[PDB]
């Protein structure tokens, strides 16, 4: 069973969604990011860029998603003491909401953050005891 | 910004298991198991999205190396208040595959959300109970 | 080149394409009992076909990107093979036959990929497996 | 739903040849030969699309492995009642390449269809004669 | 990092024409004119790649908006010292298409380079002659 | 017509360095250095795009083989009248990496342009000054 629902009938209205996500990182890792000492690059900016691209890639990643003419995409990342918080904002005038884009942007930005600081988060067994992406959800539609 | 040189590294067994969880309403869950979801077979569609995602990891994550995957499995099991996704990836390369397992899980969870969007939204078009709880690398 | 649709009107575009893949009876039997190793053939194939519809412009050089409003891939099991019928809809300046054809083709390819080991003969060849005839069976007139 | 483990498979020469056919009106084949098709060089464009599609196979087919393709060729011949496409793909890896050759051919045929849509449609905008027939993996 | 809001902008006929050029050895030009390059029909393959590239712009340029293109054309002219590429894109949207026309031209130039790689390399495996130059929006 | 067979080729170290340049107006360059560009951090965004681009080469260039890249780095330096992009790609495979390096550089430059469009345009919406000047392979390992 599979299908992309018919939205021909629905009306073209302003669509907005704000999604929030959090990735738990080690205190030393946060310091490295803050002082921009991560060899792979500027963590925050790289993740934002990855998050913005992801928003546009949503339909090819999510099967039943409609291709949508996005009008605005913003990914904000705030550094906290226990990790990083990602907030993505998406908007367009279409006949089907944009939460999936906002949710995809956030998810990828969080993944990208993880990829950027892998060597600092892994322990002597090459594992992640502390690293964890927790609570990705929709703030408001 | 850069993809670090792995030239001087040995080709070894690379394996990774990731687990993720999405909180859903009980009514939504019941419909998922009774396969009464309008958009289709939720768990299978999500496994597929997750497996495809494992392969798209390098185009989604900037500093990730394009790698030769040998095995990819995404398992999803229904629980009383949500679905649990477990992704497993394996390869023989000079750089691990946890990003692939992490991406496969995130997209599978994203797909589960998409497939039940209308059953989870309240009368304000808001999602007060839905959320992707905890994606983490179980073992590498 | 990608033909200019600038001065074309925004209208309802819909197309239905059907295709067929010849499979062994034992394969057909595996698909029904949900005993195919790589997974649920029908659903995986439908999912791939739906995604392929959106991928059309990326695969076919002169195709325009299109705001698809509806995409459905139906897969019916027959004793000698699987039948795929894809339906695409959109209100735009250019029809959607190509999207329906691509969706169906990729669905058929996916079914094949899923049951490859049951279709192969002792020499590793495919003397019975065959994608027979993809066709546009109908589409709104423009 | 999963990408089967090929970790312990042998690394050996993998080759696949696929043949496909698209039935077209003669007035169409006429324009193809004369290269009077508005959208462009039908044959070369379809071949290019086919080569590209060979590489996009794993992105399109869920359970396919990303493989290091070493050779891809799409041959298209003009016949009186249609065009025949033959795609060949080679590699030295631990899993076959029939899917790559099947996809290259499938997309090469679709591109041909796209290029001559205008000429194949009948008075009611239907495609009563156009058809993609028999895509198969060839022996030897 | 952000895709600027364009919801309040006017929908209008958007067009963009980009010109680009690649210097090649005269011996390479000859092989293209005669259709004697191993990899294939340089002009048609580069044009096909450029057209596809126009559609991929939003996927390659981070802050680019996904735009419903209505027309894409890639002209490639053979000159005595190289090949000139001219791409034209058109749409009716809330934001221009210069980036689509620019991307089409660049990828077509890159494809040309790829097609004739072996013919351009000198004895040290270098490309002292080959060069993509002056990609710009004209008019 | 096709992607030539590289089977008989040897698996060796492949590396290329490409240099590219985009001409920008002085006021645009000032905003870049002051981080006053509305779209974001021009340098990092362009670098990230160039690196991703390196990986998409086979998808963009028809006769390119898919390659297991081992190193991709994009350098971007601000100059008086424009930005200089230098991409370095490396692999150990049967096909060099000049195309990956050229593509990374090209996309990085396109990204710079996209980022400062608003500052380059004139009152007509044209770009009389903006120009991607000269993308080229400045060096690459010799292969036999």
Curated annotation (Swiss-Prot), chain C:
Highest taxon of the lineage: Archaea
GO biological processes: Mo-molybdopterin cofactor biosynthetic process
A Pfam family that the UniProt record links to this protein: MoaC
Stored InterPro entries: Mo_CF_biosynth-C_arc (IPR023047), MoaC (IPR023045), MoaC_sf (IPR036522), MoCo_biosynth_MoaA/MoaC (IPR050105), Mopterin_CF_biosynth-C_dom (IPR002820)
EC numbers for this chain: 4.6.1.17
One Gene Ontology MF term: cyclic pyranopterin monophosphate synthase activity
UniProt entry keywords in alphabetical sequence: Lyase, Molybdenum cofactor biosynthesis
Chain positions recorded as substrate binding sites: 62-64, 98-99
Enzyme class: lyase
Catalysed reaction equations from the record: (8S)-3',8-cyclo-7,8-dihydroguanosine 5'-triphosphate = cyclic pyranopterin phosphate + diphosphate
Function as written in the Swiss-Prot or TrEMBL entry: Catalyzes the conversion of (8S)-3',8-cyclo-7,8-dihydroguanosine 5'-triphosphate to cyclic pyranopterin monophosphate (cPMP).
Subunit structure: Homohexamer; trimer of dimers.
Family: Belongs to the MoaC family.
This protein's name: Probable cyclic pyranopterin monophosphate synthase
Organism: Sulfurisphaera tokodaii (strain DSM 16993 / JCM 10545 / NBRC 100140 / 7) (Sulfolobus tokodaii)
GN (gene name): moaC
Curated annotation (Swiss-Prot), chain F:
Record-listed E.C. numbers: 4.6.1.17
Residues annotated as binding substrate: 63-65, 99-100
Keyword annotations of the record: Lyase, Molybdenum cofactor biosynthesis
The name this protein goes by in its record: Probable cyclic pyranopterin monophosphate synthase
InterPro entries, per the entry: Mo_CF_biosynth-C_arc, MoaC, MoaC_sf, MoCo_biosynth_MoaA/MoaC, Mopterin_CF_biosynth-C_dom
Keyword RNA-binding on entry: no
GO molecular function list: cyclic pyranopterin monophosphate synthase activity; GTP 3',8'-cyclase activity
GO terms under biological process: Mo-molybdopterin cofactor biosynthetic process
Active-site residues, record numbering mapped to chain: 114
Family in the record: Belongs to the MoaC family.
Domain of life: Archaea
Catalytic activity reported: (8S)-3',8-cyclo-7,8-dihydroguanosine 5'-triphosphate = cyclic pyranopterin phosphate + diphosphate
Function recorded in the entry: Catalyzes the conversion of (8S)-3',8-cyclo-7,8-dihydroguanosine 5'-triphosphate to cyclic pyranopterin monophosphate (cPMP).
HAMAP family named in the record: MoaC_A
Pathway(s) it belongs to: Cofactor biosynthesis; molybdopterin biosynthesis
Pfam families: MoaC
Entries under Gene3D superfamilies matching the protein: Molybdopterin cofactor biosynthesis C (MoaC) domain (3.30.70.640)
Assembly behavior: Homohexamer; trimer of dimers.
């Amino acid at each position: 069973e599979a299908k992309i629902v018919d939205i021909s009938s629905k009306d073209i209205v302003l669509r907005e969604a704000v999604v929030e996500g959090y990735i738990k990182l080690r205190k030393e890792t946060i310091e490295k990011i803050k002082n921009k000492e991560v060899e792979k690059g500027d963590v925050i900016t790289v993740a934002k860029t990855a998050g913005i691209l992801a928003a546009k890639k949503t339909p090819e990643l999510i099967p039943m998603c409609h291709p949508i003419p996005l009008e605005f995409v913003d990914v904000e990342i705030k550094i906290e003491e226990e990790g990083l918080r990602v907030i993505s904002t998406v908007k367009a005038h279409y006949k089907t909401g944009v939460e999936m884009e906002a949710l995809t942007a956030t998810s990828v930005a969080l993944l990208t953050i993880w990829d950027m600081v892998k060597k600092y988060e892994k322990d002597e067994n090459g594992q992640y005891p502390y690293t964890e992406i927790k609570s990705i959800r929709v703030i408001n539609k």
